[PDB]
């Protein structure tokens, strides 16, 4: 009973409806579990908050975002592995254990990738108009919301926080959503393009003086210790408008560091966008 999946990593053979199916991305994971998709492992380590039900013990440890216990995924012997661009390189090594889908969201495409990626997990799983109902579900949500973004003039810049550092994202980046799909005017539509973005100090958020700004805490996560108020929240910045109309936004990491392109994750991001600007 297969299938054959194109990915962006080649192409894959999978049995529909797989028995046993390792996930390593956390998007994938939510968006499964929204589609009340049964899952046998999980790297546990990283589990974002609104995940925790999957540190059960009926679900196996496969280890680390980035650390893969290999070895106990060999001992699972799964029908499915699903990665994402954090073990991209890795994907020989799953590959050799087990069919491997990668699946990424195109930033410059988001709402395209991130519509592919459900599809393609409504096909596996036969879960195809489920898969569209929470599309068109997301659909609607991002309409009412651009209709808001649009009854107002206001640029936003989006921001994320490790240890004091601060680094900045704009169209077609990996928060640009925000921009792109959301219908927020930039404060900067130029900014470099990386998934960890151009860095950038308190000067250069004073001088383009946005009136939002959304800010993403990674130490909260990554470090286990939240500091992003501590780092954003100073004199540097606390004279631009954003400070000043209560317009700083911070983004719970949980979603938008951890996970997103899920169908809980991205309407749950859409969600923190749309409250923020109300
Ligand atoms: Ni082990
Ligand atoms: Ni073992
Ligand atoms: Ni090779
Ligand atoms: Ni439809
Ligand atoms: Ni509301």
Same mark, same amino acid.
């Given at each position: 009973?297969e299938?054959?999946?194109?990915h962006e990593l080649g192409?894959?053979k999978?049995?529909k409806?797989?028995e046993?199916?390792?996930?390593?991305?956390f998007?994938?994971?939510?968006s499964?579990?929204?589609?009340?998709? &049964?899952?046998?492992?999980v790297?546990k380590?990283? #589990?974002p908050?609104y995940?925790? +039900?999957?540190?059960? %013990?009926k679900? &196996?440890?496969?280890?680390?975002?980035?650390?893969?216990?290999?070895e106990?995924?060999?001992?699972?012997a799964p029908?499915?592995?699903i990665?994402?661009?954090?073990q !991209?390189?890795?994907?020989?090594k799953?590959?050799?254990?087990?069919?491997?889908?990668y699946?990424?969201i /195109?930033? +410059?495409?988001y709402?395209d %990738?991130?519509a592919?990626?459900?599809?393609? #997990?409504g096909?596996?799983?036969?879960?195809?108009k489920?898969?569209e109902?929470?599309?068109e %579900?997301?659909?609607?949500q991002?309409?009412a919301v651009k209709?808001?973004?649009?009854?107002?003039?206001?640029?936003?810049?989006?921001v994320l926080?490790?240890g004091?550092?601060?680094s900045?994202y704009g169209?077609?980046?990996?928060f640009?959503i925000?921009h792109?799909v959301?219908?927020?005017?930039?404060?900067?539509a130029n900014?470099?393009?990386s998934?960890?973005?151009?860095?950038? %100090?308190f000067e250069?958020?004073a001088?383009?003086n946005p /009136?939002?700004?959304?800010?993403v805490?990674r130490? !909260?996560?990554?470090?286990? +210790?939240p500091s992003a108020?501590?780092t954003?929240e100073?004199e540097?910045?606390?004279?631009?408008?954003?400070?000043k109309?209560?317009?700083?936004?911070?983004?719970?990491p949980?979603?938008?560091?951890? !996970?997103?392109?899920?169908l809980?994750?991205?309407?749950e991001?859409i969600? &923190?966008?749309? +409250?923020?600007?109300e």
């Open positions: 009973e299938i054959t999946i194109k192409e894959t999978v049995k409806k797989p046993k199916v390792v996930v390593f991305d998007g994938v994971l939510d499964l579990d929204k589609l009340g998709v &049964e899952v046998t492992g790297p380590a990283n #589990l908050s995940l925790e +039900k999957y540190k059960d %013990s679900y &196996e440890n496969v280890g680390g975002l980035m650390e893969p216990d290999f106990k995924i060999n001992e699972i029908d499915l592995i990665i994402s661009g954090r !991209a390189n890795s994907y020989e799953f590959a050799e254990i087990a069919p491997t889908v699946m990424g /195109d930033t +410059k495409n709402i %990738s991130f592919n990626n459900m599809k393609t #997990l096909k596996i799983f036969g879960k195809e489920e898969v109902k929470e599309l %579900s997301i659909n609607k991002i309409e209709a808001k973004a649009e009854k107002t003039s206001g640029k936003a810049l989006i926080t490790t004091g550092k601060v900045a169209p077609g980046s990996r640009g925000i792109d959301l219908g927020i005017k930039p404060v900067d900014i470099e393009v998934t960890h973005g151009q860095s950038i %100090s250069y958020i001088e383009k /009136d939002y700004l959304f800010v805490d130490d !909260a996560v990554v470090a286990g +210790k108020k501590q954003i100073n540097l910045v606390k004279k631009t408008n954003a400070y109309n209560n317009r700083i936004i911070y983004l719970n949980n979603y938008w560091y951890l !996970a997103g392109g899920g809980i994750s991205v309407a991001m969600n &923190e966008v749309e +409250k923020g600007i």
